[PDB]
Amino acid sequence: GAQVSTQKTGAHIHYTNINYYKDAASNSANRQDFTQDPGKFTEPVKDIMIKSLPALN
């Protein structure tokens, strides 16, 4: 039950992982979660605002 994942590499390879314990709080940190969604804190308006259009008309 081995997991093969990709390593952090430069721009312009794999590693193997096996879990030994039974609790899942014993596992290693999730360092490869690169999900973003800034539209909650930024631009949180009810009506959408187009960039080229005047904010108030």
Partner: protein, 269 residues
Amino acid sequence: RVADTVGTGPTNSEAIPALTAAETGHTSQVVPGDTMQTRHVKNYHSRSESTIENFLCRSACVYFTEYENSGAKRYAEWVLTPRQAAQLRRKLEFFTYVRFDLELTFVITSTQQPSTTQNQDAQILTHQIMYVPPGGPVPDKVDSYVWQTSTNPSVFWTEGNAPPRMSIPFLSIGNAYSNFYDGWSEFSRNGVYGINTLNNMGTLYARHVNAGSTGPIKSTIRIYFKPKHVKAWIPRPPRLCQYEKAKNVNFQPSGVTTTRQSITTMTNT
């Protein structure tokens, strides 16, 4: 992958991306090529080190304390909390609610104390670390029967080996931990403010199992927290002021920022 610059040329139109209303509460989403001519620049940069995990997942000393093999202080105790130190507290309090597992490490060291005793040959020292969850019996003495650790977790460790390390899961009765609590534990609204039982994680006890020598020795234990598997909600403004207490948010009023010589000075005074 971070965004890539788009190439633009000259413009003459009624499109006005540079003009907006900040009263709306909205951050403008203008690119550089909205107000100047730009070339095409593919960007290979990555925001991998800015993830909440990488930002929080490093070990940090949160407390240290001493005990001796002889004399009044034979054992040490400490209520687990990350608010005693400044650095991890300030990083954690970027958010209102967090949820994480913990990785716990200990660094135990010993030092020989001055005395007139002679012919002192010391045997190796073993230490016991015991975690008591909130509600259980606590040790009144070094030889207290509670050290039997029938149910309470314990870690025995002999000087010269690797540091001891264990994993602790999310233990909150509530869905998420709380860094801030605007309220009281009493419905009357009397009593201490900003205090609740959501983030209570029990107490830690430490002792020598043997005394080792006929002369005096003093040990110190340092505790290290590492948050794992993190989730966080509601971003908060960073702590401008110097922490004063562990239990509350009290502070001393401080200037918004540093002062320069004038509004056109390009240096820091």
